[PDB]
């Protein structure tokens, strides 16, 4: 249009995920196009060519880590391009004046850190790709920061093609990271009204439940759920896991086939459990076969009740960790007294 660099975000499987929720620990497989086709067979002065050929990616450094060894420049046929290098700069102030002047002349402003891809030899780059109208594709994967997941928050990525010193902007690609915040309660039964005893008392030998509410995965998320587990390393000095637990959906779940599993539905059989009575730990994992059936357009959240017994006098704490695609999120810590 006619010189129209583009930027899209993709997941690992190559699905377009522009504007989608992206879980902490996920990778953004950004694809940048270097739009050269309109240049084919044109002639340009040596002087113009000497202004060089660059591609800037003003990536959101506060949120993402570049995965340097996944960054590739290819032509569209997939062939590796040599003669283009890339340099990350933590700021513009810290970049060569050559770079600062280049950007100023293209009227491009960047925020904090960015990447500059460079044609090492503008003459050979010209002859080989520009004159021949051979557009390129830059794969620039960048991974969400795990901590970001405690907070959530928007990030955006922006890019610029710079030919002959003229600058051309891609669209801005926006994503959001969900805040995942698991909760833990203490209850005597599964009744939905049952009293939270967090901060209260439990009798010796009383049977009770630790209720572990998982983090909420929002609709419109960017990739398959592979892992959603509840790991409860409880205090074996005061608590004994009786070997009974149940798992329930917390929301209506929409499957890929279009069916709906309603909120509160017993899904215990779509989970497995590891126990360890010695170190007092239990882990409940959804089966990956089940998780694979959830539509990317569905929210997801579950909760597990662990049947416990109080077996000593004293004050005992409990906290659980919800793992979501292998990132760990800790619940609040509950406390009861016997
Ligand atoms: Ca074009
Ligand atoms: Ca930046
Ligand atoms: Ca333990």
UniProtKB/Swiss-Prot annotation:
Residues binding Ca(2+) 3, per UniProt: 58-59, 61, 111, 113
Subcellular localization: Secreted, Cell wall
Cross-linked residues, Isoaspartyl lysine isopeptide (Lys-Asn): 7-157, 184-318
BAR region involved in interaction with Mfa1: annotated segments: 92-118
Residues involved in Ca(2+) 2 binding: 2, 35, 37-38
Sequence positions that bind Ca(2+) 4: 233-234, 236, 279-280
Protein family according to the UniProt entry: Belongs to the antigen I/II family.
Subunit structure, interactors included: Interacts with P.gingivalis fimbrial protein Mfa1.
Function (record text): May bind sialic acid residues of salivary agglutinin (SAG) in a calcium-dependent reaction. The interaction of SAG with its receptor in various oral streptococci modulate bacterial colonization of oral tissue and is associated with reduced levels of dental caries.
Misc. remarks from the entry: S.gordonii, a commensal oral cavity bacteria, is among the bacteria most frequently identified as being the primary etiological agents of subacute infective endocarditis (found in 13% of cases).
Name of the featured protein: Agglutinin receptor
Biological classification of the source: Bacteria, Bacillati, Bacillota, Bacilli, Lactobacillales
């Amino acid at each position: 249009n006619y010189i129209k660099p583009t930027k899209v975000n993709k997941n690992k499987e190559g699905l377009n995920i522009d504007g989608k929720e992206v879980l902490a620990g996920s990778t953004n497989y950004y694809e940048l196009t270097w739009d050269l086709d309109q240049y084919k067979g044109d002639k340009s002065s040596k002087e113009a060519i000497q202004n060089g050929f660059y591609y800037v990616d003003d990536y959101p450094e506060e949120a993402l880590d570049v995965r340097p060894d996944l960054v590739k420049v290819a032509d569209e046929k997939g062939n590796q391009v040599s003669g283009v290098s890339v340099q990350q700069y933590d700021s513009l102030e810290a970049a060569p004046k050559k770079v600062q002047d280049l950007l100023k002349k293209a009227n491009i402003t960047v925020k904090g850190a960015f990447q500059l891809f460079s044609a090492d030899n503008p003459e050979e780059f010209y002859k080989q790709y520009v004159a021949t109208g051979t557009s390129l594709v830059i794969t620039d994967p960048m991974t969400v920061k795990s901590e970001f997941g405690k907070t959530g928050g928007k990030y955006e990525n922006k890019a610029y093609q710079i030919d002959f010193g003229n600058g051309y902007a891609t669209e801005v690609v926006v994503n959001n990271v969900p805040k995942i915040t698991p909760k833990k309660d203490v209850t005597v039964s599964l009744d939905p009204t049952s009293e939270n005893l967090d901060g209260q008392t439990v009798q010796l030998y009383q049977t009770f439940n630790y209720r572990l509410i998982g983090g909420l995965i929002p609709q419109n998320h960017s990739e398959e759920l592979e892992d959603y587990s509840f790991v409860d390393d409880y205090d074996q000095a005061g608590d004994q896991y009786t070997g009974n637990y149940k798992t329930f959906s917390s929301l209506n779940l929409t499957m890929k086939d279009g069916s709906v599993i309603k909120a509160g539905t017993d899904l215990t059989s779509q989970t497995t459990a590891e126990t360890d009575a010695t170190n007092g730990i239990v882990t409940v994992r959804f089966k990956e076969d089940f998780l694979q059936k959830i539509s990317l357009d569905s929210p997801f959240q579950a909760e597990t009740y662990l049947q416990m017994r109080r077996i000593a006098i004293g004050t005992f704490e409990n906290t659980y960790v919800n793992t979501v695609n292998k990132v760990a999120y800790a619940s609040n810590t509950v406390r009861t007294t016997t």
